[PDB]
Amino acid sequence: MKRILVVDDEPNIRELLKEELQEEGYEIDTAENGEEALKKFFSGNYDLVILDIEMPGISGLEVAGEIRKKKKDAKIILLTAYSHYRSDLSSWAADEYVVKSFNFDELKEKVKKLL
Ligand code: BEF
Numbered sequence: 001m002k003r004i005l006v007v008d009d010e011p012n013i014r015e016l017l018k019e020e021l022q023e024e025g026y027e028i029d030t031a032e033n034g035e036e037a038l039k040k041f042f043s044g045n046y047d048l049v050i051l052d053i054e055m056p057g058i059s060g061l062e063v064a065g066e067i068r069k070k071k072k073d074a075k076i077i078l079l080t081a082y083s084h085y086r087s088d089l090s091s092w093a094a095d096e097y098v099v100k101s102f103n104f105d106e107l108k109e110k111v112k113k114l115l
């Protein structure tokens with residue numbers, strides 16, 4: 001069994017992502033903000049973290065930087081509604097960048113790839 005930490009500030013989106021990823025057979029934990037994400041991540045044992053960018057408090061780009069620095073071999077996907085941040089220097093902390101779609105096939109392919 002693989003475990004994924006799903007981080008997004010929007011509760012209905014956390015719910016949707018958790019359902020979609022459970023369907024693929026993963027065990028899913030969630031966090032509602034970056035600060036919570038970092039606490040769960042460093043205290044836990046996740047195979048992959050999926051990180052929203054826009055959140056109240058520290059951004060997912062900031063979270064990605066911290067995880068990359070303190071867990072060199074982490075698997076990190078930025079999953080954001082917005083294509084804006086793709087060219088952002090800070091995105092280089094992530095293994096993949098995915099713009100949220102209502103067709104989850106792309107996200108699932110990238111998750112499968114990283115695991
Ligand atoms: F709020 Be996330 F960047 F879609």
Ligand SMILES: [Mg+2]
Nearest residue numbers: 009052054055
């Ligand atoms: Mg958000």
